[PDB]
Amino acid sequence: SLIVTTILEEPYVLFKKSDKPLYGNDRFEGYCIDLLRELSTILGFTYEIRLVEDGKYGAQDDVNGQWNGMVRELIDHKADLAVAPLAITYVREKVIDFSKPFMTLGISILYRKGTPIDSADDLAKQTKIEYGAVEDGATMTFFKKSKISTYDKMWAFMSSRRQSVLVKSNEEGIQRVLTSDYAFLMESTTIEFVTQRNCNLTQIGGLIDSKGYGVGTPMGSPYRKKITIAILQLQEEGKLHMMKEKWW
Amino acid sequence: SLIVTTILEEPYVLFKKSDKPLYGNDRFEGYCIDLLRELSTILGFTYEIRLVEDGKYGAQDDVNGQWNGMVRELIDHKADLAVAPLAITYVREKVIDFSKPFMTLGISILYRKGTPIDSADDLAKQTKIEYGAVEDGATMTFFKKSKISTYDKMWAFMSSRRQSVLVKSNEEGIQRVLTSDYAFLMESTTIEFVTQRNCNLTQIGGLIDSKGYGVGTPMGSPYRKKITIAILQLQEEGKLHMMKEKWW
Ligand SMILES: N[C@@H](CCC(=O)O)C(=O)O
Ligand SMILES: N[C@@H](CCC(=O)O)C(=O)O
């Protein structure tokens, strides 16, 4: 029986709401839970869903070099699989493995409708409107690592206001956009979900980069190849697209 | 020194234009040639480019299960890497390895402008207008394997006329569209290139599936991880996007 680490994030993973108490895997639903069920059936494994203890996606600590979040769990073999909206990035590929992508996306900007702000550039060159990203996430790590002028500038702004502009979760980021003058750097897939339920919010500009979500495994896992093949099958039969339409 | 198999296909790989003849790697230019050079610079390997002998991408024989094209080259270890617009698919992943995708895309339809035809369904429900794909390619294999009713139907049409509607190359397919009542099932990236150079041609409908191109390697190759890491670096620093702008 495989240990699967994941994280609460609508509409990928959320607590099923019901009248009666729910236990184990039954507590959860969402796109990634659907995915996990398909993978379990194809590859023929049983599993236990465990929410990542520290509630993080995964980043390397600057000072001690230690990883956190789901990535860390994989590193220490505390989980067999990470099934979640986990971005495939070059820093992560150095320490874990990923299946081929089950979804493609890009960093973009979440802000309110009807403002002059039309790009990351517009944001970088002012200080009135604050902006940030999820702490210890792939988006924050992009900006932290970027050599591109505009993004280095935005990272300088973010790190100096770290206290107020880097959030613990997408939901906190969205809440800031709703309740203050704040633009949120987040993934385009999640933005599409958010703007479908908040008719006063929109995506600003296009995609800042391009990346995929993949299932994470410890480096050298024998499951990576099997999961990659299952994902490509799900993709080709239209099942991933069907799952996205269901949850968005 | 690495042997790298590839195939002619604009604008990914083409013979460079010149006054005096060229020799060796110098003969080649294109998107995938630039990609190969960047990989070479990052990983530090030397290489010799060889055009795939049979001029095929790679498909599997139904009866004996033997592969051809670039895929076979990799299986038989007659090449170290395949750098070309080689589609990541589940049947190929069973026999070779791919890096993470350096480009994402999807099957679509190339046809002429100003017609009533608006989707695959329109082609499927008639016979006057012929349609086909490159023989022994990922697109043809998609139709051959599909259980989606529309595509299954299109495959029954294609296979019964395989002699007349399946072509040896994208170039032959395009030529077919230009000289007869024929719609060509082909990859969206290439369609985008082609329609820029022929004003009477257009894409019909949206993307039929979603897939990526990957650098192919013989199964188990240590270069898979390194190239994946490198492709992600190139992607994140915006170099892959520049390369696409350059050739499209
Ligand atoms: N999906 C991201 C977290 C959210 C973000 O960074 O925008 C990750 O894998 O780390
Ligand atoms: N890029 C395709 C060939 C062209 C096609 O099938 O449309 C492949 O890897 O097989």
Curated annotation (Swiss-Prot), chains A, B:
Binding-site positions, L-glutamate: P85, A87, R92, A138, T139, E187
PTM comment text: Sumoylation mediates kainate receptor-mediated endocytosis and regulates synaptic transmission. Sumoylation is enhanced by PIAS3 and desumoylated by SENP1. Ubiquitinated. Ubiquitination regulates the GRIK2 levels at the synapse by leading kainate receptor degradation through proteasome.
Glycosylation positions in this chain: N200
Domain of life of the source: Eukaryota
Effect caused by changing N200Q: Loss of glycosylation
Residues exposed to the Extracellular side: 116-248
Family listed: Belongs to the glutamate-gated ion channel (TC 1.A.10.1) family. GRIK2 subfamily.
Subunit structure: Homotetramer and heterotetramer with GRIK5. Tetramers may be formed by the dimerization of dimers. Assembles into a kainate-gated homomeric channel that does not bind AMPA. Can form functional heteromeric receptors with GRIK4 and GRIK5. Can form functional heteromeric receptors with GRIK3. Interacts with DLG4. Interacts with NETO2. Interacts (via C-terminus) with KLHL17 (via kelch repeats); the interaction targets GRIK2 for degradation via ubiquitin-proteasome pathway.
Stated name of the protein: Glutamate receptor ionotropic, kainate 2
Organism expressing this protein natively: Rattus norvegicus (Rat)
First-to-last residue of the parent protein present: 432 to 799 of 908
